Homo-oligomer: A and B are copies of this chain.
Amino acid sequence: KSFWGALEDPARYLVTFIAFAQIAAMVAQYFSPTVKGAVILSLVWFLYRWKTNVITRMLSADREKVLTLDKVSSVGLFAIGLMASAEACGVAVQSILTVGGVGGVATAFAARDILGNVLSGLSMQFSRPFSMGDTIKAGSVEGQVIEMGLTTTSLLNAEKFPVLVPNSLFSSQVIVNKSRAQWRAIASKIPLQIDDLDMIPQISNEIKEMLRSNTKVFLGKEAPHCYLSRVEKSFAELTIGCNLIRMGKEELYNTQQEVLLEAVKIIKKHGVSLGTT
């Protein structure tokens, strides 16, 4: 019915048997082998009893999980029970133990991925690299964290599909956390159709001025830049860039578009025109 009975039946059987053997030998002397064999067989029987009542108990309340557990647990204890009494009796100890050992690391290397996922899940619960809702990018996958488990994490990628990442990928690869950034950084390239480069400096400086007198820019770490990155026949390329304050994602788009339009306005104000890549 419970653990109490599952113990008190084998315990009483074992005490009965050893008390029998004691007065079977006192009034040919293999008390130790028989007693050890009885102890081994009795608790093999006891955990069989305990296993059955446990997986009968939660079947008395996620169902195929329970018999998957039942069958896996039955195989496991069949294995150990066979090993243990083969060792208690003394018949073919090293042979059966060698078979069991090679089966064990067969299973132990075949299960390196499940174990990797579990151990990496624990390591992640220690050093939290992200939390629920953060937009992360792990190697090839990218999205919003929607579920954190022990063997897998669940993301929502750019097409708004739920992705399932095994947790052993967060220990061998870098993780980008797009939700902990304190300032953003934009950079673009504008092509110019220009032959009188004598006004590339002026334009450049003016654009930088525009980027410094613009709200939503961050002048704390790096200054806005706009330099000539390559030149060609009636062609030039300006590389613009700056840092922006911590903003949302529609405001980032609006700021990018606004900076681009103001830069093109400054460019066309000096009589220059855009080029063609």
A contact set with B: CB distance below 8 Å: 36, 39-40, 64-65, 68, 72, 80, 83-84, 87-88, 90-120, 122-123, 125-127, 129, 140-141, 149, 151-152, 157-166, 168-169, 171-178, 180-185, 188, 190-191, 193, 197, 200-201, 204, 222-223, 225, 227-235, 243, 249-250, 253-254, 256-257, 260-261, 264-265, 273-277
With the chains together, A80 CA to B103 CA distance in Å?
13
A222 near B249 (CB under 8 angstroms)?
yes
B92 near A88 (CB under 8 angstroms)?
yes
Oligomeric state, in number of copies? 7
Chain B residues, Cβ within 8 Å of A90: 36
Given that A68-B122, A127-B152 are known contacts, is A183 also in contact with B160, CB under 8 Å in the complex? Answer: yes
With the chains together, A188 CA to B277 CA distance in Å?
18
Given that A36-B90, A95-B83, A116-B113 are known contacts, is A174 also in contact with B184, CB under 8 Å in the complex? Answer: no
In the complex, besides A99-B104, A113-B168, A232-B274, 7 extra interface pairs with C-beta distance below 8 angstroms are A84-B95, A87-B94, A162-B176, A165-B174, A197-B265, A232-B275, A232-B277
